[model samples]
Target: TSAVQQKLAALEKSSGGRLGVALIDTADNTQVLYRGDERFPMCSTSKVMAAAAVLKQSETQKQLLNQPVEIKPADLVNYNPIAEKHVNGTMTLAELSAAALQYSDATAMNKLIAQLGGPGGVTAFARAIGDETFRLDRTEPTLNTAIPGDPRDTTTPRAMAQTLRQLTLGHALGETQRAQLVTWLKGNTTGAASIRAGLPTSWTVGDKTGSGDYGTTNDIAVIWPQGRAPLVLVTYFTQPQQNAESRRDVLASAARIIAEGL
Candidate 1:
């Protein structure tokens, strides 16, 4: 086992149940740290794929990025009313992608998919990424709250981390598109207070969170400069006591522990 794995062993012991992790430096394709099999549910992190699919398809179809689109509030599913606070029903595809990443706004994502096509279209996008291994299911909120019309989403840590790798390396998206995706990831709006709880301010981070069902939780993030050869770290915890603070601390702890001896 690698040094990273050795630290992870210590983390798992303190974490209660099983914990899986993977981190790779974007600057170089090196596994700085990793633990467990790649296949594990990583909640909202799956949105990275959804976004990638949209951008990839947009590149191939030569869609106009600045094209204006409208979001009907009535069509939104399990979203915070805050997102709908904007009076204008219209926004560009770029705007929706921004909202989705920053706010973890499911409504924005679903609405964008609907405008393009529908859930079927989104699934097709996932299929295009060769992620046909896991079933695409709706991700439930931390407390078992269901968004009435939202499509259930699911993905593995490896899948999410792979997407990050592709994004940084320009494998999945074109140069401009890849840059756009990274810009959004760097500006992520949701779950910021959790995963990045403790780290050097000089080190930049791009993080995304997935939360649904009391037992379902996922987070995937990549640190900046790629020089840190930052590992794409992911942790999914599905225990009864998975409270918000506890989850945050657990992920934070894992991050700190993994980076300690590196």
Candidate 2:
């Protein structure tokens, strides 16, 4: 195993849980993996895909971004802080995308998925962008089922990192959409204790985090070190929901391993 792989393996064993991690240094495309092919529940991280799909829709029809959307109480889903405060208020597609990616707001993502073309359309969007292992099968709170070994709404670490790279660093989204996505991720409020905690705060970073049943916690991010290229990193960690307590530190520790190895 690679040194990075060995370190991650050790970490996973110590935590008594499984971990899937993948990294790519965008400068030269240096890649790292540890169980990167193993699937894990996506949880709210699907918001990243939902946001990208909406941006994809806007690529051809620029008018779509500014179209107003009203979030009535009936539209709200569980864990929707951004929507809860603005019920019956109008928010544009752009604002909803921002709320979903930055805050992991459940309702924002579900609405975007519905608006763009439902869950399958988002899956098709990923397919068009070369993602074969990632699947967005259901919308939030039902999507957080995270049953061990179940396949629905799951994605491998490598696949999530690849999709994130394409959307953020690659040309999957047009320039305007890419900038908007990055802006939303950079201001994220949900990942402080996850991957961001593992890196130096000075490094420019953007990320999306997800939490689900069965102790699943994950973060996908782009990290720019002081004098090197931006690194795309993903860590998905989970244990038995019955007996294991999920810790954001697990993701942080995995990130620390990646930074040191690189």
Candidate 3:
């Protein structure tokens, strides 16, 4: 087995719950790390899908990003890490999308989901992209309350990696849309202590993170190693042994291992 595979296997063996991981080399469509194919809760990571759906739907309808959206009383929810900063006022769809991605804001994500019609709209776009393992059945706050075993916006590591690959390569959206999504991902600050923690200072990663009940931690990213081809790394750590910080450290170690192999 490859070094990265061995290290990832060791990581899964040491962790309390199952870990699903998929690392792909976009340069030539190579799989660098592959562990399990089981569906795991995506949590806030589903925001990536939500963003894609909005952009894809935009092509058919008018540009939804530029349209004004209001944060109704229904949009307000607890556990919002970003919404507290903004006053209860109107903002564009683009701004909401950015907040959702960068801060993993539940309210912002649900707003985007609403703009896309509902959770079904996000799943429809996932199915359209040939991702059979992804399902978005609930809104943000409700999905956050779900446990690891319970099905709440679940997706496999392979599916997550492929979806990110598609988005980064512009297979799912036009150049402008792709740029918008990637820019938001690059601005993601929620996972700074997860996968990004292990990356070298020179490396750049566009990623989204997910954390939910029962110690579920997830990060799916497109990693740019200076001048080399970008790599897609997706990881899910559930039912962790320690606190959230320890789980993130595990992800960071796993990320470092993958980077070394690359």
Candidate 4:
């Protein structure tokens, strides 16, 4: 634990950025944290929680997943290639949830949040899952503002890692829903250079990525090493300046460092 912290410190220094990392070995219930308590903007990763909440809600309302909605071109938002092609087409609630989680489709995310009454619903779900620090104050695009000191729409790495662990492996969801969530995460089209790129071949990775202002490029994931218990990893990185460019390479390197330590 101690060595990994110092190694990550040096990596953070070399990259000229602040990095918040939280890793947990579910096998032994051990954790290694580096500035993991500091708050960072959540960006698009909140979709994971939103999707999970919808899945949980769907338990009682079995028809929620099969409900279909017609699409128009006018509702498009930033970063929605998958949804764009579906303009003037049809998509089910399950399809929309998959679009939101797997591709970070902005329109898909916005529509999904409305199902639970707005961004606060995500906050409510977070609290319900024992993650006290996650807050989604505003809707998408706006939530990506990522003000330096403002706590709105932010979460700590440690808190996020815990939330992910509960959702991915704990009692937060039933077996089918949890497996479905993992399927979406594993099929994540985003984060090509993030944690998954740093893993050994066929290590079986599933992740959620969040990109925001101030160089905030984060990835929260569950990693399954060959023949071993899964590991939960959360990396939140930011530079001092606002509106800085996002950096995924540093995240890849950070994940590599974590893997090396294991």
Candidate 5:
């Protein structure tokens, strides 16, 4: 087994639950490391998809990026500190996308999904971008509510990694639109202790994080190592006892493993 595979084996042994991960070297279009293929809960990582969907629609539909919408009470959802503070205010699609991607704001995502014609919009975008394993079954509030055995927003590790790679490589969006999406991702402040925590300060890492009540902690990122080509890293932890802090540490440890190989 490779070094990353050995480390992932250790993680799987100790996790006591399912863990899905992938690392890709962007320069060669090669997978540096990975493990597992189960569908993992996406949480706010779905916001990244939602943002892309909206941006794609904007291009074909001629929708203005900055067109503002009134924030309804129904648009509000719990667990979003950013939206909570800006309640009842007007925000454009661009503003909402930033809030969702940067802060993982549930309310902002809720609104954006609706603007894109609901959950199907995100899934459609995924298909357009060649991620065949992604699905969005519910909006927020309902999304956070119990769904028995399955997560409402879900994607496989490989699919998520490839999605990020395609977007970062400019295959999924034009330079202008892709750059805009990259800005939102790089602005992400929610996963500070997750993927970014593992990398050196000199590297530029952009990612979106997700957490669910059912013990889901996930992050998908694009990492630009100084003086080298960028790579994509994704980690998902699903266990009743797995909390954000522990999962962040797991991701950091995984990053350390990948860093050494790079």
Candidate 6:
């Protein structure tokens, strides 16, 4: 408890506000860690579950791994101006998965999910795990986070953490499918300087990072050591701060503390 308090204080100091954090030790079910409200808007972290839902749906339908689909420019949405400048419009579904994992390609992902069944398919998968209040919107979902060309996605930190745990534990998918999802997750992360910046050089982390075009940033991850226990970390940075550096620092420190403290 004392450790948790000191960590929370450190986060508040760095963030210029409170941050939501949730941790679950894969090695021990009793060691869950949480701070702040569980239902706050989740931002891009929603992609993780959405990805899982896609994979589960595909496997259920016996979709072939190598099946290819063309992505036109019309499918791209809410692209970051900087990133959009570098990418072409054509992509395969496999490439779409890779793009979403590698760069948080909101437009490609939203198009693909909608092709699969939109919010209804993903939300139904989420509900199978016992959460009914969670939902996903292709357009900006939350008013507090509305920003043009922004994917206004939201998910409770707890819901995200639990969903990740379920995926890691093979709860809603076959063992092969679960392994495939984690493989892509570890390969396609963008947060090299934050939560993951603190892991041991040899440690492996299955992670994802997200930021809205409006500036909402988040990092969520699972780490593996050869012989040590696995740990999951979730951190979201929202609202406005004095500067971008401040927001990055807040996210890095919050993630580092939870990674080490646990």
Residue-wise lDDT of candidate 3 within 159-199, one digit each (tens)? 88888899886488888889888888989888888999989
Cα miss at 180, model 1 (Å)?
0.7
Number of the top-ranking candidate, with TM-score as the measure: 2
Our model 2 lands, by Cα RMSD against the true structure, at 1.2
Clashing pairs in 6: 42-155
How many clashes in candidate 5?
0
Q: How far in Å is the alpha carbon of 156 misplaced in model 3?
A: 0.5
The runs of at least 3 residues in candidate 1 whose Cα sits more than 4 Å from the true structure, single-residue gaps closed, are: 26-28, 32-35, 115-120, 132-135, 139-152, 225-230, 241-246
> Tens digit of lDDT per residue, candidate 1, span 57-175?
67966665666676665645676443476435676777777877777776666655554475456567666656553344543232133222232444445555665666655466789
lDDT of candidate 6 over 1-262, digit per residue (tens): 7596587666776565546677777787644445534444555666677777767766756664445555555554665332254355445555566666667777656645665677777677788877655676653223225243333346656666777777876477778778877887888657787677766768888888766433466788877866868777777666544233325566777766765676
Worst 10 residues of 4 by lDDT: 69-78
Ordered list by TM-score, greatest first: 2, 4, 3, 5, 6, 1
Candidate 2 local Cα displacement, residue 159, angstroms: 1.1
**Candidate 6, which segments miss by more than 4 Å at Cα?**
80-90, 140-152, 240-246
State which candidate, 1 or 3, has the greater TM-score: 3
Clashes of each: 18, 0, 0, 0, 0, 1
TM-score for all models, in order of appearance? 0.80, 0.97, 0.92, 0.95, 0.92, 0.83
181-250: candidate 5 lDDT, tens digit per residue: 9888888888788888888989988899877755667789999898889989988776655342335677
Clashes of 6: 1
Q: Number of the top candidate by lDDT?
A: 2
What is the C-alpha local distance difference test score of candidate 4? Answer: 0.86
Residue 257, model 5, lDDT: 71
Higher-TM-score candidate of 3 and 6: 3
Model 4: pairs clashing at backbone N, Cα or C within 3 Å: none
Residue-level lDDT of model 2, residues 1-262, one tens digit each, is: 7888889989999886789999998888878988889998888788888899999999998699899898888888778888888887878898899989888888888889989688998999999999998887888778867889889999998899999999999999999989999999999999999999999878999999988778888899988799998999999988876446667999999999988888
After best superposition, candidate 1 residue 57: deviation in angstroms?
Answer: 2.4
Q: Tell me which of candidates 2 and 4 scores higher on lDDT.
A: 2
Please list the residue runs of candidate 2 whose C-alpha ends up more than 4 Å from where it truly belongs after superposition: none
